[PDB]
Amino acid sequence: QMPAVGVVTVKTEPL
């Protein structure tokens, strides 16, 4: 089989 994961894309933000 093939495991699956949940990923989040990263981008710079100003705070």
Partner 1 sequence: ATRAFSQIKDAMVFAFNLPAIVELGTATGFDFELIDQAGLGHEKLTQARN
Residue ranges binding partner 1 (CB under 8 A): 4-6
Q: How many residues does the chain have?
A: 15
Report d(CA 9, CA 7) in Å as an integer: 7
Using alpha carbons, list the distances in angstroms from residue 3 to 6, 8, 9, 11, 14: 11, 17, 19, 26, 35
Q: Which is nearer to partner 1, 4 or 10 (CB)?
A: 4
In angstroms, what is the minimal distance from the CB of 9 to partner 1?
17
Q: Which is nearer to partner 1, 6 or 14 (CB)?
A: 6
In angstroms, what is the minimal distance from the CB of 12 to partner 1?
26
